[PDB]
């Protein structure tokens, strides 16, 4: 019956969420990942993945499922009416940690398109061998970041789109190269070296960069798209860090289409009436990776987001992405087919390559209740439909029925086909985009004195009567 007017501007969360003194700690156990650093190996006949690609250049987005605090247990003096107000979690402290030695992570594939070097010479030879490309290896560039948001982060790349139908003269033409931005998966790589172009739907020779980024897309986060949205979602504490350097100077194959103008050089004679190259790819190199500036195992907290919402986690969810390439060791492994021969050989020992990574996450969550009297109800539904739809405020349909018969023996010839054959949503829409699930349904702890981060948060704020004087001195 005639609801009041809704405010045309958005607002911070200080006005409509409450803050109590009830804190909880949630830390996952240990997370390990082993595989090959270059390509996911597969059978020669068909697709099946024996080892996963694991190298220290991926994105490693995490997905934290939180317990629903509308049926959750508390100590005394925490009360609410479930017909009037509901509850939601808010993070105040977060840590990302790794225990490893400190590595480098070089790469290079045996068919790299190099012609010559253009740093010194004595006489340039126009050579043009059929595929004269040669193995050259290189270093990369070190980067770090941490992004914490309620929804996944957003990166970008430079790709290819359809041009205007004006002129079509040759299959050897140039694309338009428009800019698009997508959602970030778990396995997309970053290089702040060659940069954000997918080397598959843009480069057909696929011999431009090393092979760890040759069948995939090298993305890069935005930092403009994720701050210009009017809510303050998807990131609220970012810490950027990287270093770079240039090492060597080379040449591509040289089949130039964008020709040089005439009125730029002077024509000579003899061997001096040609072109050497115009296309130059340089190599990157991360240098001096010293472990005093590493933005890790340091428990930073939150008092202010850069956006409008604080660490309120709608939908009982949370996302963490960390990027590291400082622990990029490589493990030269080898094993021998026969040990009895008392002389070493060519082919008696055959070798492999592996890469590993170890993570650990710890959080500090804070309780937040939200009262709802007819005004924020209009606001929350307009923020996102699923936030109001995860709580039932409508009464029952006319047939409710006994929810699902639940047959006992699910695989037989007696019953018909069962178990979720027509899948009506209710699921996450982001099911088609993979992540790393971290199940924290019953990881929580009400006390936090005997926890490795819990005293570090407790020492920072006031600890007066909170610890308690269990059995005394005299």
């Amino acid at each position: 019956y005639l609801p009041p007017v809704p405010v045309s501007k958005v607002v911070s969360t200080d006005e409509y969420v409450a803050r109590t003194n009830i804190y909880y700690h949630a830390g996952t156990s240990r997370l390990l990942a082993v595989g090959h650093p270059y390509f996911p190996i597969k059978k020669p006949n068909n697709n099946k993945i024996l080892v996963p690609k694991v190298s220290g250049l991926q994105y490693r987005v995490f997905r934290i499922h939180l317990p629903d605090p509308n049926k959750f247990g508390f100590p005394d003096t925490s009360f609410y009416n479930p017909d009037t107000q509901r509850l939601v979690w808010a993070c105040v402290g977060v840590e990302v940690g790794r225990g490893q030695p400190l590595g480098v992570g070089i790469s290079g594939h045996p068919l790299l398109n190099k012609l010559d070097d253009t740093e010194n010479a004595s006489a340039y030879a126009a050579n043009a061998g059929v595929d004269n490309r040669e193995c050259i290896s290189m270093d990369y560039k070190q980067t770090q970041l941490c992004l914490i948001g309620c929804k996944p982060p957003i990166g970008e790349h430079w790709g290819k789109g359809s041009p205007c139908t004006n002129v079509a003269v040759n299959p050897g033409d140039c694309p338009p190269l428009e800019l698009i931005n997508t959602v970030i998966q778990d396995g997309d790589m970053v290089d702040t070296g060659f940069g954000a172009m997918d080397f598959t739907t843009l480069q057909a020779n696929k011999s431009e960069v090393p092979l760890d980024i040759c069948t995939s897309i090298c993305k890069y986060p935005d930092y403009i798209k994720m701050v210009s949205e009017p809510y303050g979602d998807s990131l609220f504490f970012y810490l950027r860090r990287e270093q770079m350097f240039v090492r060597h100077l080379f040449n591509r194959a040289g089949a130039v289409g964008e020709n040089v103008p005439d009125d730029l050089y002077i024509k000579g004679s003899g061997s001096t009436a040609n072109l050497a190259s115009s296309n130059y790819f340089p190599t990157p190199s991360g240098s001096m990776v010293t472990s005093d500036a590493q933005i890790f195992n340091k428990p930073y907290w939150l008092q202010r987001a850069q956006g409008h919402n604080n660490g309120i986690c709608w939908g009982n969810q949370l996302f963490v992405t960390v990027v590291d390439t400082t622990r990029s060791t490589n493990m030269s492994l080898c094993a021998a087919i026969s040990t009895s021969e008392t002389t070493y050989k060519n082919t008696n020992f055959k070798e492999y390559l592996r890469h590993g990574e170890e993570y650990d996450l710890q959080f500090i969550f804070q309780l937040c209740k939200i009262t709802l009297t007819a005004d924020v109800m209009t606001y929350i539904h307009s923020m996102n439909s699923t936030i109001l739809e995860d709580w039932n405020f409508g009464l029952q349909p006319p047939p409710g029925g006994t929810l699902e018969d639940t047959y006992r023996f699910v695989t037989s010839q007696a019953i018909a086909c069962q178990k979720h054959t027509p899948p009506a949503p209710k699921e996450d829409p982001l099911k088609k985009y993979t992540f790393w699930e971290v199940n924290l349904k019953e990881k929580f702890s009400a006390d936090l004195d005997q926890f490795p981060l819990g005293r570090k948060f407790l020492l920072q704020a006031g600890l007066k009567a909170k610890p308690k004087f269990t059995l005394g001195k005299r």
Partner: protein, 110 residues
Amino acid sequence: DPMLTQTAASVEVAVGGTVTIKCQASQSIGGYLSWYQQKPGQRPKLLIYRASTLASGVPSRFKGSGSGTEYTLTFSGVECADAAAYYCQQGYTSSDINNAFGGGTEVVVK
């Protein structure tokens, strides 16, 4: 195997006529194509490469066009020393081909 056939014997032309020699290719070769004049007593001699760029010491009265699979070579103002043999030739430098880039002749001009 990219093949240029050139099954075309040249027609009798007078002084100042225009001749359209057409060289068609089965596979797409890009723009990499050459042309030559062969006087029947001496070494062969080239006019144009990449179907648009002419060589040194050659007048600009020879023309070059064509892209993709079919190409041409036209000129006008036929002199007395244009009685020679002509040949179109690709540059796809493949291995399993047996090209010989053959075909082409030119009558004695009246």
